[PDB]
């Protein structure tokens, strides 16, 4: 039938209906209940600092076959442990065990898996407060 | 050359206050002593009674605004006006 109610003296049911069906969607529900920031390892932090533990390479999802390098880092703010992809040509050679590092989100869709590497969520920026990009380019030197 | 626009009189304090303009096209901004010795000429003022407040030369202009002030007696600036302006004009060490 006609989308109802519409009576001049019926705004209550209108706003009730609207608010109820708002709950159907997901993003607004995620904002209000604060689900992301009560599941966030980084607590809404644009970057985090941590210590390196080990280096592992992962098999690119098919049909892409590749050994994407990455690291295991336990961060200092709370002590949780995560995986971080290492972009750069021969990047992994610079990174060593027991390294102070700086990590941020990878930029996949909804911050999720980025393309053909599933599971990873993050990339490294600075190691020992030294940006990795120039280290890849060799302009700067790791301490 | 120096061209005046305002001479007005606060008789409650006994000051003739003066707004004027200095036309100095192509030469550096004048100093206080020389403009003082100029102004004192065609207004018939005692230099000891006269204190120049400010001179301001606007950006990219050859005509600079200037405000000066002349009382009646020596006690008037010692009681009303503050020491530093006498210091700048040299009436006080």
């Amino acid at each position: 039938g006609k989308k109802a109610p519409n009576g001049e003296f019926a705004g209550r049911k209108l706003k009730l209906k609207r608010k109820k069906f708002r709950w159907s969607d997901i993003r607004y529900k995620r904002r209000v209940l604060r689900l992301k920031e009560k599941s966030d390892p980084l607590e809404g932090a644009p970057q985090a600092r941590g210590i390196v533990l080990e280096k592992i390479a992962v098999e690119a999802k098919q049909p892409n076959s590749g050994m994407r390098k990455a690291v295991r880092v336990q961060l200092i703010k709370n002590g949780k442990v995560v995986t971080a992809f290492c972009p750069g040509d021969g990047a992994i050679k610079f990174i060593d065990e027991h390294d102070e590092v700086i990590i941020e989100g990878i930029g996949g869709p909804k911050g999720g898996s980025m393309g053909d590497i599933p599971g990873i969520r993050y990339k490294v920026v600075k190691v020992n407060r030294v940006s990795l990009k120039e280290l890849v380019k060799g302009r700067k030197e790791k301490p | 050359e120096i061209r005046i626009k305002e001479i007005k009189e606060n008789k409650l304090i006994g000051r003739k206050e003066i707004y004027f303009e200095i036309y100095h096209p192509g030469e550096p901004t004048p100093s206080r002593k020389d403009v003082k010795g100029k102004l004192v000429a065609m207004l018939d003022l005692n230099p000891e009674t006269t204190v120049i407040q400010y001179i301001r030369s606007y950006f990219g202009s050859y005509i600079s605004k200037g405000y000066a002030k002349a009382y009646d007696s020596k006690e008037r600036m010692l009681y009303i006006e503050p020491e530093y302006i006498l210091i700048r004009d040299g009436l006080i060490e």
């Binding site: - | 096209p25 192509g26 990219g60 202009s61 050859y62």
Partner: protein, 173 residues
């Protein structure tokens, strides 16, 4: 309250048509940044928005603001003296750009090249009403259009400055 930009970025910085029209207007006017052209279009858009609102307004205040709009746009020398609210909507960016100081002083034959005019502007060899300026993006008003002359203290005031005769012969030739 934070001071806001007075210019707006295009919705898509890699559309060919707008990019090349901008490029054309840049080589026809040699403005340092697209920022400046965007700003001028912003002024245009604000004038047009005011016009549209006023056309969509009824009230003594509406009429008064309409009069003010017409009076100002004429004062800037953008429209004929019998201009109405209708014709402003047909205004173009080139109308505004013509009113620029760089464009006006170049059309006054005081520079072989409008970039040479810009250099004179920044070097303050040019004066308006006996006051120096250094802003090539200035949209001069109508009633000062005859007062743009060489700075009296600049060497270019002397008719024997080595550039001046080249300016004059380029003007003639």
């Amino acid at each position: 309250k934070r001071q806001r930009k007075k210019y707006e970025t295009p919705p898509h910085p890699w559309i060919k048509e707008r990019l090349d029209r901008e490029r054309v207007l840049m080589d026809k006017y040699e403005l340092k940044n697209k920022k400046e052209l965007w700003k001028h279009e912003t002024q245009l858009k604000n004038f047009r928005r005011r016009a549209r609102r006023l056309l969509a307004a009824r009230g003594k205040q509406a009429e008064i603001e309409r009069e003010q709009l017409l009076a100002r746009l004429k004062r800037l020398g953008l429209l004929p003296e019998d201009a109405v609210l209708d014709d402003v909507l047909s205004l173009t960016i080139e109308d505004i750009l013509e009113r620029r100081l760089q464009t006006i002083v170049y059309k006054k034959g005081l520079a072989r090249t409008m970039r040479q005019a810009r250099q004179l502007i920044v070097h303050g060899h040019i004066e308006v009403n006996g006051q120096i300026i250094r802003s090539p993006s200035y949209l001069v008003l109508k009633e000062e259009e005859d007062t743009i002359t060489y700075a009296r203290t600049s060497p270019f005031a002397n008719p024997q400055h080595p550039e001046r005769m080249m300016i004059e012969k380029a003007k003639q030739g």
